[PDB]
Design a protein around this ligand. Structure first.
Ligand SMILES: *C(=O)[C@@H](NC(=O)[C@@H](C)NC(=O)CCCCCN=[N+]=[N-])[C@@H](C)O
Ligand SMILES: [Cl-]
Ligand SMILES: [Cl-]
Ligand SMILES: [Cl-]
Ligand SMILES: [Cl-]
Ligand SMILES: [Cl-]
Ligand SMILES: [Cl-]
Ligand SMILES: [Cl-]
Ligand SMILES: [Cl-]
Ligand SMILES: [Cl-]
Ligand SMILES: [Cl-]
Ligand SMILES: [Cl-]
Ligand SMILES: [Cl-]
Ligand SMILES: [Cl-]
Ligand SMILES: [Cl-]
Ligand SMILES: [Cl-]
Ligand SMILES: [Cl-]
Ligand SMILES: [Cl-]
Ligand SMILES: [Cl-]
Ligand SMILES: [Cl-]
Ligand SMILES: [Cl-]
Ligand SMILES: [Cl-]
Ligand SMILES: [Cl-]
Ligand SMILES: [Cl-]
Ligand SMILES: [Cl-]
Ligand SMILES: [Cl-]
Length: 454
């Protein structure tokens, strides 16, 4: 089934590297197609014939429970657009070990591996990693920073849409994330480009391959296609307080006599600061609890109220024609990635991600907990001590003070809130352009509203 072939494919690649090195084949010799074919064939026969011991990270009880869950509850994905396919990956946050996965509805009927093989746009699940996480890390925004959701157009002249909405006005990062508004993410990524932030540095540290970083829609998953396993590794990094561990299924390959062919070597990388990661955890907690883009917390509270009280964070995504839905879930111990869609890229129902995938993934997390009662953990995500806490205006997301509005000095006062920052100095004093993005017209409207309240 999926685990047999995924494991064999990875073991064959590791055996290929081992045999080439053993036989002293140069990097140049390895470029020769005939030599590669020979070593791929030799690697396959060595595994087939050779009595190697392959040690995996798979938790057999958990993986078996995940197979039973998709067998029993996969039908909950069927939304009237034909049989819906599915991929899930369960990853240990502290190691990057893959404990179990779902490759699809039924290997016997369709062998396509939707956990490791299928690549689709991650849509809005890109935003925490590529936009907000980097902006916070770079000290360009904090937890209560204000962003423009005023109407604006892409470079191609098309309005940036959110379902049928061309936008609203200013909003907090929390509102932007809970709803997954698109315009704020557009402005955030534009700010990173304008500031010459090495976004590629962050994304490549987590193993993402993105061909063009200048794509305006990158934060909405334009110009990016990922496997469930790779994308689960991105969320692993945020959950693990910003420290990436490379995903893996194989821990070791030994000969019969115990010679080591291959052994996974941990290379932990601090991709985001602990401050950044722990701020993002707090924001993604509210994404699920707000229940705006997913019913997951309602589904899970009914199935397993005790497990629903574990410290869940996560994020949804929907591609623009409903071809792909994503739900990424973490507790401090584990990350579970989930994709649904059709092999031929035809549309799902409008609610497929909001309701169906949320209900299926609530069943999947419950099945995992029933197989391994302690595996999700009862630990909480918590702000790192290095987090800077700033008292800022609710209105501007910046510290109270005076600003020139229509040429006149205005004392900007009002309700304050604690804003969490990952820099040294925290939030700046309020400036006229207090938000991420916005036109002059947007700022005229925003300030007219704010001045009205003083
Ligand atoms: C999040 O999931 C939001 N939707 C998206 O991210 C969709 C629009 N993303 C994609 O379909 C990927 C390609 C980029 C499209 C950019 N605009 N166009 N065309 C959801 C909350 O709206
Ligand atoms: Cl399997
Ligand atoms: Cl497979
Ligand atoms: Cl040999
Ligand atoms: Cl096991
Ligand atoms: Cl992969
Ligand atoms: Cl896609
Ligand atoms: Cl515009
Ligand atoms: Cl939407
Ligand atoms: Cl909200
Ligand atoms: Cl870049
Ligand atoms: Cl990738
Ligand atoms: Cl670039
Ligand atoms: Cl592996
Ligand atoms: Cl041997
Ligand atoms: Cl740090
Ligand atoms: Cl909740
Ligand atoms: Cl609900
Ligand atoms: Cl979404
Ligand atoms: Cl789509
Ligand atoms: Cl199909
Ligand atoms: Cl906290
Ligand atoms: Cl302060
Ligand atoms: Cl600073
Ligand atoms: Cl800006
Ligand atoms: Cl304007």
């Amino acid at each position: 089934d999926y685990l047999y072939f995924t494991t064999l494919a990875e073991a064959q690649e590791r055996m290929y590297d081992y045999l080439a090195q053993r036989d002293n084949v140069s990097a140049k010799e390895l470029k020769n197609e005939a030599t590669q074919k020979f070593y791929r064939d030799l690697a396959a026969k060595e595994i087939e014939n050779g009595g190697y011991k392959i040690t995996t990270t798979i938790d057999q009880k958990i993986h078996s429970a995940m197979q039973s869950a998709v067998a029993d509850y996969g039908y909950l994905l069927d939304d009237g657009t034909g049989r819906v396919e599915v991929g899930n990956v369960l990853m240990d946050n502290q190691t990057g070990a893959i404990l179990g996965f779902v490759g699809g509805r039924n290997y016997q009927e369709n062998q396509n591996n939707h956990a490791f093989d299928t690549k689709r746009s991650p849509a809005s699940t890109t935003k925490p990693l590529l936009a907000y996480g980097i902006a916070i890390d770079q000290g360009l925004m904090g937890s209560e920073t204000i962003l423009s959701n005023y109407p604006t157009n892409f470079a191609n002249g098309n309005p940036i849409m959110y379902a049928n909405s061309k936008g609203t006005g200013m909003m907090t990062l929390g509102e932007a994330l809970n709803y997954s508004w698109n315009i704020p993410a557009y402005w955030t990524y534009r700010m990173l480009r304008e500031n010459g932030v090495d976004v590629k540095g962050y994304m490549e540290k987590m193993g993402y391959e993105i061909p063009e970083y200048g794509i305006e829609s990158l934060p909405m998953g334009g110009g990016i296609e990922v496997t469930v396993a790779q994308h689960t590794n991105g969320y692993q990094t945020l959950a693990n307080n910003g420290v990436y561990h490379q995903k893996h299924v194989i821990s070791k390959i030994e000969a019969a006599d115990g010679r080591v062919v291959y052994e996974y070597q941990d290379k932990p990388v601090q991709v985001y600061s602990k401050a950044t990661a722990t701020i993002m955890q707090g924001l993604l907690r509210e994404v699920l609890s707000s229940r705006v883009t997913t019913t997951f917390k309602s589904n899970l509270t009914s199935l397993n109220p005790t497990l629903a009280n574990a410290d869940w964070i996560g994020k949804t995504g929907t591609t623009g024609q409903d071809e792909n839905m994503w739900l990424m879930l973490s507790t401090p111990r584990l990350t579970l990635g989930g994709w649904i869609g059709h092999d031929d890229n035809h549309s799902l129902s409008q609610q497929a991600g909001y309701s169906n995938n949320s209900n299926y993934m609530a069943h999947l997390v419950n099945a995992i907990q029933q197989a391994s009662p302690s595996i999700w953990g009862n630990e909480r995500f918590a702000l790192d001590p290095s987090v800077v806490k700033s008292e800022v205006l609710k209105s501007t997301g910046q510290k109270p003070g005076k600003v020139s509005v229509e040429g006149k000095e205005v004392e900007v006062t009002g309700s304050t809130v604690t804003s969490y920052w990952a820099n040294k100095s925290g939030a700046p004093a309020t400036s006229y352009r207090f938000a991420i993005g916005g036109s002059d017209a947007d700022y005229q409207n925003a300030w007219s509203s704010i001045v009205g309240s003083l």
